[PDB]
Design a protein around this motif. Structure first.
Motif, PDB file in Angstrom:
ATOM      1  N   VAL A  64       0.836  -1.197   0.000  1.00 43.46           N
ATOM      2  CA  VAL A  64       0.000   0.000   0.000  1.00 43.46           C
ATOM      3  C   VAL A  64       0.875   1.253   0.000  1.00 43.46           C
ATOM      4  N   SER A  65       1.432   1.588  -1.160  1.00 40.54           N
ATOM      5  CA  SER A  65       2.358   2.711  -1.262  1.00 40.54           C
ATOM      6  C   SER A  65       1.971   3.683  -2.372  1.00 40.54           C
ATOM      7  N   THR A  66       2.573   4.870  -2.348  1.00 40.72           N
ATOM      8  CA  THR A  66       2.333   5.876  -3.377  1.00 40.72           C
ATOM      9  C   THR A  66       3.289   5.685  -4.550  1.00 40.72           C
ATOM     10  N   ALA A  67       4.434   5.066  -4.280  1.00 41.83           N
ATOM     11  CA  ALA A  67       5.392   4.739  -5.329  1.00 41.83           C
ATOM     12  C   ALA A  67       4.823   3.647  -6.228  1.00 41.83           C
ATOM     13  N   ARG A 122      -2.756   7.222   5.158  1.00 41.18           N
ATOM     14  CA  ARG A 122      -1.862   6.605   4.183  1.00 41.18           C
ATOM     15  C   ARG A 122      -2.619   5.697   3.215  1.00 41.18           C
ATOM     16  N   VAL A 132      -3.671   7.159  -0.760  1.00 39.38           N
ATOM     17  CA  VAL A 132      -3.177   6.241  -1.779  1.00 39.38           C
ATOM     18  C   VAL A 132      -4.309   5.870  -2.729  1.00 39.38           C
ATOM     19  N   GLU A 139      -2.773   9.372  -5.222  1.00 42.37           N
ATOM     20  CA  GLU A 139      -1.513  10.056  -4.951  1.00 42.37           C
ATOM     21  C   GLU A 139      -0.325   9.187  -5.349  1.00 42.37           C
ATOM     22  N   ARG A 140       0.527   9.721  -6.218  1.00 46.79           N
ATOM     23  CA  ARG A 140       1.687   8.986  -6.706  1.00 46.79           C
ATOM     24  C   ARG A 140       2.973   9.787  -6.535  1.00 46.79           C
ATOM     25  N   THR A 141       4.015   9.126  -6.041  1.00 47.14           N
ATOM     26  CA  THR A 141       5.318   9.759  -5.886  1.00 47.14           C
ATOM     27  C   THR A 141       5.895  10.130  -7.248  1.00 47.14           C
ATOM     28  N   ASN A 161      13.758   1.755  -9.808  1.00 46.32           N
ATOM     29  CA  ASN A 161      12.652   2.674 -10.059  1.00 46.32           C
ATOM     30  C   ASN A 161      12.916   3.590 -11.250  1.00 46.32           C
TER      31      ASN A 161
END
Lengths: 320, 330, 327, 326
Positions: A183-186, B110, B114, B118-120, B312
């Motif tokens: 569960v991450s934004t990356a 969080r 998400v 929301e994306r890094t 990445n």
DNA sequence: CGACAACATCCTATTACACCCTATATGCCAACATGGC
DNA sequence: GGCCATGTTGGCATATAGGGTGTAATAGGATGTTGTC
DNA sequence: CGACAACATCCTATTACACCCTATATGCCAACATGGC
DNA sequence: GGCCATGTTGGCATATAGGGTGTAATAGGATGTTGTC
């Protein structure tokens, strides 16, 4: 403390999953019913009552992992209110083990999904590729994505249009933010092949989901072939199961009346299918772990455990 | 920090005395962030009538949900919470983060943000093609500014250094190897173990650029002078040895270079619409991946210590697609 | 010394000292050393050393800093005082703000003055080849033993102490003639399964020659390497292993054999040392394009951070970026 | 019940009520450890329950003094932990002293030169040599043993699982091979799979055994049965062939091929129950078969465990060897 | 006892591996800045 | 005086590194030991 | 408009993932077992 | 009956496999809902 604590946990409902809050309430409902039927108080749950209850569930005919699930839900219910867990006293901890062993002795195993291997993907592809119906294009594209990315159906249901991109080679990239474990934004980026890319291009062009970038990718297609792209209404996973079932029925026919699980293709078919096919094709461990988003190896094993042993490596080795 | 001050605990008073006695124990961008957070916390505490020290679970939860309400990111809320934890722990008081009341709402945020999409944001890649297209434009410019900026775009891409490290480069730091290449010996890195290495080398093609810069600016007139300094209007370079070119200025160089090629920016109000400080590193990583350079050599080139971070930057390539992808096309 | 303090503290300290072999011998050496330094400083400075007060330790670390000592050394002293108090069942001196903040401050102050942790001078493939062409043909016992050792240390990336604990019964074999070596106890792993370092053909030949000339195969319990006495008299032992000091001098003698003497500046790692064998090999694998999982297998690493920490001092001139930009 | 000696008592009644919660062997190891502990305690005048950390320490050091392996001592300690946690008492392993002497026993015994021994591999070469020796002999013994070694090498099953194989669990496929369905696995999930298959030669051998033993009379009969003097097969549907005889097959075969087990008091000088699986994993790694395939073929769930079987192969000698062989 | 090679022992100083943790950078804005035309 | 590059300085938002802590190694110099002539 | 395909909703039963802890197998011994010549 | 081949039975010694606990997903029936020819 054990009353205005729960409303503290209940306050942040999205902190836990929705299915968790469903199963908790369900288990509590069953527990409450059984407690009112046998003249027993249900909170706090006393070890002996829990013992007789789990024994009852065993006697009914429920699986081991189901009973263990109720015990776990009682555990969560109590622990979330700062109370001692039922599975801390021997009276329950032991009867659980006894139930497991006794059930296994009866010849009980945990069922797995029906394999959706490569040959099935091809055999299906040679049927709906010619057909230009808005149902067939969608379903075929979805089977393609499912077998390619090894994603769970709930994750494919949340694939928005603004997540699809492209490698310089023309292959599509699907960005996933939330999975069952991560569960991450990356997030992660699952790449598609070329054929699947054509199968999904042919759906995006026709369905008209290219309008709003916030549109959900796969959507419901009504009776006469009219699609209905929505950016707020997520395509339910039940439909995604019914697609698999519809395909399997299309090829092999209707399923019988035994009422048994995994008799037809399901949402977990593509995962185990790709896992088995990769295991059979000499693909190493880290690559299989990456393609499925696994952080452990025991999971991979638990997936590829039921490979057809007749064409196994041993039988092949005893050729000479 | 003497702008908000409430005192009820006097045992704490002794605990803060040491904190002020050892100010250099923390960086500048840590004290600045601590103040920047605590002013927000105190303001919101005043507008919502809550005692701001010592802080407590249910009152902090409201602050986190308030930060989410302002449409802020997750890492920034985590940042604020972390600064609160620093302020609390350094005062000998337990952290509000340990309590379930704050943990649950933190994970709630969080999860929600998400699911909201929301994306890094990864930095825009500044690659060999981009840099060559820059070196086809700003190459024979009589301007001192274009020479400086081109030399800078050479150093950033070649060395994969961070802007603060490029800014700290003095003239005496540059050596000449046996092969005529420039050897930038890193001066005062604020780290004991510099995983990236303490001497970054330049190619001949960039060496001539840097040499041209130093010979048309006159920074080598003094050994202790900063290499990259400010070039004032009408092309008058200003050496210093006591004042550095700000990092923001270098970012402005990158933005100017992106603007100079692909036109002005968007009216979107976001991040990484143009090139920045990370651009050269990311782009170089991608160029090494395309060149089949092993991951260890890449991680040694950039100075990364985790493989996933590098992964990445190249996840959108064909080199690292799925195994299923390679299995489905045979 | 000691001096009266609790009863539970004496019992706990006495309990820890009782099971001394549980910890490393070096841990004890350094614990006693740090305690000696700290106690001496305390008596000179008219203070009590147990239980340590949070601002007696501070002045002590500041004293060590102004004494010219390194950051990590001070750090170590602190960690050892902690090791004492936390085993005693007492609050750690590191958990008070004074000590921690003055520690950070010491580190930052010394770094901003220009301080970097040194690394061992690399012993790379080229050097192993040079030393090879230098010694490999000698009938002298010491040359054979030394070359065999260097070969093993470079091929296996084993720390010198682990090499000095190699017995003949630990060496097996593969079909290709390649020697297998069982290592039981290392710096990170202490198990009975251990690891199996595999030698190549040439290194195998070297070790074969050493075995032949030394005559350590007379007993499986003999240490693979041993001390050579004057006139080439080998003294194989099973009770007494070779020291690591001697193993270092091997590296130093080998280095000065080629690059002359050492200069009188006094800095560390002017010549080769024990660690030199590891580092070099690592920097030989990265340049060769060896993947991370294969590198972690050849050194017994569980983290990539330590690998990067090893190869951090690679040559930038022949690096990837300079190669790529000069296409 | 067993070696005798107040709120704990009700909890021990709790434990001894639900007895089929633990395996029989678990109970035997527990009772064994408890017996040794009680004996050593009575000898040295110590209250054997509740076990004090100090007495436990002295006892562990004693077990080390007897020359026992680290794993054995760990097992004893884990049994005392079992009993203590099942009584709601503080586990001895949690105290400082016991932790310290366990660490110490570890370091000292490892420094002593202790090693975990690998089972001697039973590979294809050995199976073919054995097959070349017997094969034609018309005795029930040799036929049975040949079939057994065949199945063991083919399925990579553990001996206890081979012993439980009934006739009704045997199926046949179109290809003319045998499909052994695992009747009862001890667990809820079988990673190795619940459907093993045999090659053609293994098939004809096994069916030769089935044909000549008369075990096909009852579908409930176990596949392998006891063979009596002068070759009298004893087909039974209830009395299972013991594991010790099943490994007696292995080591007696090893005697028939090689010499006789040299008196050293060591293990794995001959073939045992693990030989087939190790040999098979080595053969597959040699044949180029990938790690997942092997792990699934055997049922292993960790890569390192399989890597240990082939740590002496040439294909897996690390990178430095490839770098230097140049 | 010495010479002499070649070590082993002690000591303080310094680096190294691994698990869990947080600090310090960069991105980019509005708000001042300043010399040369 | 003004204008306009070409900057500089908090300040705040957001991402990425680096450090604490524990245990165990090496670095190396000063000194002691040991088996032959 | 009506049929109705094609879905969403609900509840309960069951599997999947992952971090962490311990159970249950095999090895091999000495003493005991039992048909069939 | 006697006696050997050829096992079987608990034990202690050693090692390898599997489960516990937490959280999140799917499997699938029974039932309800909505555009659209």
């Amino acid at each position: 403390e054990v009353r205005k604590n729960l409303m503290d946990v209940f306050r942040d409902r999205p902190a836990f999953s929705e299915h968790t809050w469903e199963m908790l309430l369900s288990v509590c409902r069953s527990w409450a019913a059984w407690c009112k039927l046998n003249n027993r108080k249900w909170f706090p749950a006393e070890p002996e009552d829990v013992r007789d209850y789990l024994l009852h569930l065993q006697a009914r005919g429920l699986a081991v992992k189901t009973i263990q699930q109720h015990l776990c839900r009682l555990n969560m219910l109590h622990r979330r209110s700062g109370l001692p867990r039922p599975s801390d006293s021997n009276a329950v901890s032991l009867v659980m083990r006894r139930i497991r062993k006794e059930n296994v002795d009866a010849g009980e195993r945990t069922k797995q999904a029906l394999a959706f291997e490569r040959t099935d993907f091809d055999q299906v592809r040679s049927l709906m590729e010619n057909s230009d119906r808005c149902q067939d294009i969608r379903n075929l594209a979805f089977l393609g994505v499912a077998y390619n990315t090894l994603l769970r159906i709930a994750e494919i249901a949340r694939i928005r249009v603004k997540d699809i991109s492209r490698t310089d080679g023309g292959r599509m990239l699907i960005h996933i933010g939330r999975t069952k474990t991560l569960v991450s934004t990356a997030g992660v980026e699952k790449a598609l092949s070329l054929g699947v890319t054509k199968l999904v291009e042919r759906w995006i062009s026709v369905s008209g989901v290219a309008d709003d970038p916030n549109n959900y990718l796969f959507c419901r297609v009504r009776r006469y072939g009219v699609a209905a792209p929505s950016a707020t209404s997520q395509l339910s996973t039940y439909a995604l199961q019914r697609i698999f079932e519809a395909t399997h029925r299309l090829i092999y026919g209707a399923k019988d009346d035994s009422g048994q699980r995994y008799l037809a293709w399901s949402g977990h078919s593509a995962r185990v299918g790709a896992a088995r096919d990769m295991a059979r094709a000499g693909v190493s461990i880290p690559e299989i772990m990456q393609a499925g988003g696994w952080t452990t190896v025991n999971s991979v094993m638990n997936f590829i455990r039921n490979l057809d042993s007749e064409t196994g490596a041993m039988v092949r080795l005893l050729e000479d």
